[PDB]
């Protein structure tokens, strides 16, 4: 992992089930609320702040997801498309990174093809076994409970940038880039 | 039970307690939010995509639920039904199948007569003791945490159709009917 | 407990913390959502159906709660008052029962007075120890996860009325009265 | 802690991850819902009632949070502030107390500088190990599950004021200052 982690320059995360606990909160009008986790966002920022682009590939789309994407300043992303293989390379071309430079975090079958495309994949804790068996690393955290952060934390760990989340001083350093 | 699982051409699921964790999110106007798990949605489609029909039979009726049912493309169902036996038999007839080819996943006492009516019956992990004792298989996933997907996975697996969720290759092939 | 239980004719429950997980869902305007558990609802209906009245006591009054109280068909209740002692006596006089015939289920310091006024008291699994200390029976289910159902099943069982919930036929006989 | 606890005359609490479980429930417009635990709510009031001021320092700012704040009667706070060191000192000045007289409860990296600035610091149970390593005391309750209340009880206890949450009498005596 140390191997591939240090080489990551681009992170692609699914949304529902990863940045989310997979719950689709409906009201009479369809998707009404989507729950993201505050620690994941800080992690997204810490990555970006540490020269590591972050994009979301979601087999779904909603103004809610878009808003969250905008709050976080994510620039690269693909929504509504359930085929993830070509979508990743398309994100990779856009980021000027190779497969070997992009990590991916998923939770379901829909992500099986993105794990094949990115070379460095993550599975959230509550992911089913066929997904766990198809990734490089299984997270201890459940989707939506900080799984992404667990990943960002370890990517920034291996690349010697942990000080940003490790300590009061390292954090106050990148303080002007932690918002969401 | 692989036998039962292989005969299943029809699944009837309860809503509150199975497709959700049993929480009813009230507004001053009654249910204002119903949470559904994306991974359960995917599983419902895969069953459908696999020639296995799906029906909903809730003890409660809400437009929120009716919207979720429509999103999933489920045509057979009954809502607000606390008497589930008759409901189960009607649904079977509508699906053109026998009690022998249909499964039912429930969580509480209301589901007891549905159990008796359906060939195969499942209970979510958090179901009371008297519901667990009356089904063929108690699932390990709690209501609302993807217990339906745990079941649909068993069903497809047992009918040699797991490649749909087992792998990149298989999932892609049915990428056409994997929506929510 | 078996003796106290078979004598119960009246149940008074707190709300936030018992019928809910103590979570208060805020939007910019205060409580925006109250989550109640379905199996608790069936519990309340099963209790009333077995000639055991159910009242609700909460320090918080909100149209959301009132809506729930109405769906359940709960007749006696005191809202907005954090001084539960007199409230308990008033409800008991209204219910026409003695303190020895009434059960109270709580979760916080606020409920201590209630425990003392009511013959029988229950605490939800996640109540703090100084609450579990003050009651007759500490339940094993968390507040809002069906602790109330745990208690009602317990009262119904103790009264030779567990049938409505442990048998399809028992349930089907009291079905016209299970609507929440 | 004992010595620390007895001198606490001011508690500063983070919001996301402490008063809540870190989930950010998004609308197409940003945070749509914020869930706060009722017992944390009461713990805040018991603190104030015992002449211990309570302040809030949060990385995010929202009208939902401000509403909770006003309901709890909190006057000192700084929102949207990711730099918490200065803020803690400023709040300390506002409360007329010293770093020694002030406790802080947090859950993530952003809180690191807050822990260092306050005499006594707490971490919620689900905080990252790198946050736990940095606090005076790690609570056993997860953020949003009543971790603030667990701390408030410790403080009051240490000061010989547990009677408010300890007994019916102590509660009633202060019952007029328990609303949230």
From Swiss-Prot, chains A, B, C, D:
Tell me where the signal peptide lies: none
Can you tell me which residues bind Mg(2+)?
14, 16, 107
Q: What is its EC number?
A: 3.1.3.45
Subunit architecture: Homotetramer.
InterPro entries noted in UniProt: CMP-NeuNAc_synthase (IPR050793), HAD-like_sf (IPR036412), HAD-SF_hydro_IIIA (IPR006549), HAD_sf (IPR023214), KdsC_fam (IPR010023)
**Segments forming a coiled coil:** none
Which catalytic reaction applies to this protein?
3-deoxy-alpha-D-manno-2-octulosonate-8-phosphate + H2O = 3-deoxy-alpha-D-manno-oct-2-ulosonate + phosphate
Q: Which UniProt keywords apply?
A: Hydrolase, Lipopolysaccharide biosynthesis, Magnesium, Metal-binding
Query: An example of a Gene Ontology BP annotation on this entry?
Result: lipopolysaccharide biosynthetic process
Other notes: Cobalt was used in the crystallography experiment but magnesium is likely to be the physiological metal.
Q: Which organism is it from?
A: Haemophilus influenzae (strain ATCC 51907 / DSM 11121 / KW20 / Rd)
Provide the binding site for substrate: 16, 37-41, 45, 60, 68, 84
Q: Which Gene3D superfamilies match?
A: HAD superfamily/HAD-like (3.40.50.1000)
Entry cofactors: Mg(2+)
This chain's protein is named: 3-deoxy-D-manno-octulosonate 8-phosphate phosphatase KdsC
Under SUPFAM superfamilies, the record lists:
HAD-like
Q: Name one GO molecular function term.
A: metal ion binding
- Top-level taxon of the source organism: Bacteria
Per the entry, what this protein does is: Catalyzes the hydrolysis of 3-deoxy-D-manno-octulosonate 8-phosphate (KDO 8-P) to 3-deoxy-D-manno-octulosonate (KDO) and inorganic phosphate.
* Family, per entry: Belongs to the KdsC family.
Mark the transmembrane ranges.
Answer: none
